[PDB]
């Protein structure tokens, strides 16, 4: 019975490079007899073919015992050929996320560990796959072979096998839109909803379809059946999770142990709500090197301990129902941490997750919330192809005040306020026009680059003045200090005039928390005021209030 | 026959990752590519082709017909540079009207050099990575490729000879997929010559859309100083700041008389009457600002930079330049679009408008500096984009002080 051949893919070596010419390693008499037997059947099966002495390429072959069995296995080390082989288009870049899959009543697993060798290797590329089985005692020309099929270990085998398999399955899937087919490895997985009665029919039709290419598929009941252990998860017919997450009990934690714990908590955070890892990742501020046996701050133990009370019992996520709306809920945890859950039906999470701010000294809650939303939006597009509806802890009025006045363009997709503390809020608002009746403070700073001594001060319209001597400080620091002094010594409403672009850049950035306590103090002061108007003027342009205070702090 | 093409020596093809696409966009692209494949325009490719260029979908406006758009930015940069045998219409920017015409479909009637095809590979991704991505490569000249207008030039040159000889005053310029047609006609004959043009094209072998521009109506924006009867200390402080800044562009500016008004530590709301020395100085400074800048020239080997500032309540200002403080163009968009709902839609609309103007004036797109977080822009620009080209851009994260001074 005729069978359609499987077209070969043209392969080339990277430009300027030639095939590998690696020396064969000396083997034991025992390993050679094993390789000869193995190679003999492979040759009988058409997988390899003996070659003459003309071929000048070589790749080392090895023999490894199988978990202490009576059998041997051959390993051709293609590392060197892989460096000289062209790059291919990986179509298994990403694995699909469990929260995106659809629930299927029935799902069968068909093996194709044989259809792998029905895949031929481009004729003109075969020579590069040459290898040599050494002869017993090195007294005769070693046996030379080259591959006729995709070799195990070669750079392009995965891509070519997967694309060849896809091309064959392409018409079957299309014609049968009531089933899903997934080619992870050597086992084929087919899911569906139709009664098991006709789902078995579909399977037989697939096996028939694969026979067109003479690919047989082996008419037993595959050992694999739900649930499946795949890519760190457990997949069940109607639910999924991570696999088993176990947090060690330890009296000693070393950089590695903490990195290992953070990894488990991150992986666990996709389905276990509330997971926190800030106080932990903070203890690994920045080194390469295990081990050191660092200690755990009273926060690490408190934050981690709370984790154990989350992973206490198993939590499962449901699968995606395209006919139902996707909803994402976010909560602030503090210390720049945020957690979110995505679901379609109340309390039935498809998946969950966390968000952590990036490097920076000044930030605010609204900006953090926005970053979280963009992240969730992208992940959603990748997993479900759409943007979820958001439930956020921030009043519509706050958000509007924020984006209309923020210097940057910003946007959040369709959302709704959810009243669950702590809410996100704007802590202070600078004024747009100078305040009438309020005292005007002209501030300034200066520091000597060399001595590091400086002064910070202010003068006001009411004659109020102050100049404070400072050590260990920079120009930028002194200028922030001056603003702080004016805030400290003024009433609930005040006009402040500065010449510092740097200070304005920081307050125009509108932070509500900072890595610099100086800025934090200022923030604390802003929060307590009723009205504050910050004005800027150019240095040294003959201006009152400014020309004075400048002389007072320059020295 | 096929005019040959190669890449710049040094350089392999593009290998750009395809970004996540929504379900509506994927279905549109699957449907479109299915029919382009039928028609021989594109062909499925195998894994031996490691190149890739992003692709997405855009509905042109007020309509429900998707367009497929390929982001050839990377390929363009990477493909050698295709001089023939244009430099610019210095009078297109002068013409009363200009109608923009999508002629990209013409390209699909010229075959692409088989040895270059691999370089035009693109992927239609699947939701949640569930099935492999559909891979294709072009067989014909692709829209959005810079080689595309270049190679097809010869053929377009003689396709327009008739119309051009019978209308020697009309200016016709071509940029990427787009034909720009400019004339001083009255705005109703102007339309006849256009809807002629395309009937003259659609004979000659969605070009029905038009985007009318009026270069004679653009809308520059010098610096202006306020005209007030009573000045507070704050008004004068802001004025001296603005003038100090402008003195970096115009050398003759002077402040000293205005500064010497603010002698003493006064209350910001106190009214200050102007001296005659002041009011003279302010006057001489207004004059200087009416003159144009000194030593400002375009240098076509240099990049154009565009800066944009959000001025609030729907207004946006911008400047185009090559050298700092040497503006070649400045402007404002107190238009509606976009909001009052959406900041990002407005910004996207501004970028397109400024790009269009930059093409008309210099024949190339500028490199944008954008007042927005990279993560916010990337997640949303494609949802509001409507142009067949795409400019380069970078992100600004520090609020510029000069924000106010341009409004
Ligand atoms: C990604 C994937 C991995 C495996 C399996 C890999 C392995 N090992 C098996 C299949 C069939 C799929 N693909 C799809 C596509 C759409 N819905 C689903 N739903 C779905 C999958 C498994 C279970 C179960 N039990 C329930 C529902 N799976
Ligand atoms: C060139 C100068 C007049 C000096 C002295 C004061 C002075 C100077 C500079 C650079 C910056 C300031 O912000 C400032 O407040 C100054 O007083 C430099
Ligand atoms: Mn200063
Ligand atoms: Mn000073």
Swiss-Prot record, chain B:
Phenotype for residue 384 to L: No effect on RT p66/p51 heterodimerization
Extract the ranges annotated as region (RT 'primer grip'). Answer: 206-214
Which residues are tagged with the site Essential for RT p66/p51 heterodimerization? 380, 393
Q: Impact of altering residue 282 to S?
A: 59% loss of polymerase activity. 8% loss of RNase H activity
Q: What is the effect of changing residue 69 to V?
A: No loss of polymerase activity. No loss of RNase H activity
What effect on the protein does mutating residue 377 to L have, as reported in its record?
A: No effect on RT p66/p51 heterodimerization
Q: List the disulfide bonds.
A: none
Q: What is the effect of changing residue 385 to L?
A: Decreased RT p66/p51 heterodimerization
Effect upon mutating residue 176 to I = 54% loss of polymerase activity according to PubMed:9533880; increases polymerase activity according to PubMed:9657675. No loss of RNase H activity
Q: What is the effect of changing residue 179 to V?
A: 22% loss of DNA-directed DNA polymerase activity. No loss of RNA-directed DNA polymerase activity
What happens upon changing residue 145 to A?
Answer: 73% loss of DNA-directed DNA polymerase activity. 70% loss of RNA-directed DNA polymerase activity
UniProt effect for mutating residue 258 to S = 21% loss of polymerase activity. 16% loss of RNase H activity
Question: Where along this sequence does the record place binding of Mg(2+) 1?
Answer: 102, 177-178
Q: What is the effect of changing residue 145 to F?
A: 10% loss of DNA-directed DNA polymerase activity. 22% loss of RNA-directed DNA polymerase activity
What, per the annotation, is the impact of changing residue 148 to A? 74% loss of polymerase activity. 56% loss of RNase H activity
Effect of altering residue 176 to L? 90% loss of polymerase activity. No loss of RNase H activity
This chain belongs to the protein called p51 RT
In the complete protein, the residues contained here run 605 to 1027 of 1447
